[PDB]
Amino acid sequence: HFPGRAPIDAYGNGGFRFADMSHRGSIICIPSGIYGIDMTGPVPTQEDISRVLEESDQIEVLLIGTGVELLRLPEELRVLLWEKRISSDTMSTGAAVRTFNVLLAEDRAVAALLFAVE
């Protein structure tokens, strides 16, 4: 936890490194900060993305890191994200980290939900 977005400096080992900190577990990175989320699995739930929906006025794009393999976004989540005009896409956690960092550096209104991989 950290009160804004920061580049994600590492992934692997069931967590992430950012802002000279280490966090064990999955994370969501939104304009209001980086928060732990208790994902039991790589496919996000409605709860998982609740902070994104709530801050949708400040988010244009959501990257979803679905672990080691790219997984489809469930129908229910596609609808909710669409309703808030957030453009979103899934890719491996590694790919999402790298893409998040790049878009963050470009000052895009980007958010990421990242399932922590080994």
This entry's atomic model was obtained through X-ray
Distance CA 15, CA 116 (A): 5
End-to-end CA distance of the chain: 20
Distance CA 44, CA 66 (A): 8
Residue 108: how many CB atoms within 10 A of its CB? Answer: 13
DSSP state of 25: S
- 12 SS3 class: strand
- Residue 33: give its domain's CATH number: 3.40.1230.10
Cα–Cα distances in angstroms (integers) from residue 105 to residues 41, 84, 98, 110, in the given order: 29, 24, 11, 10
Distance CA 118, CA 110 (A): 24
3-state SS record for 54-82: HCHHHCCEEEEECCCCCCCCCHHHHHHHH
- Both structure tokens of 99: 């893409």
Task: Count how many Cα atoms sit within 13 Å of the Cα of residue 65 in the half-sphere of its side chain.
Answer: 29
Task: Look at the chain and report how many structural domains it folds into.
Answer: 1
User: Whole domain around residue 118: which residue ranges?
Assistant: 1-118
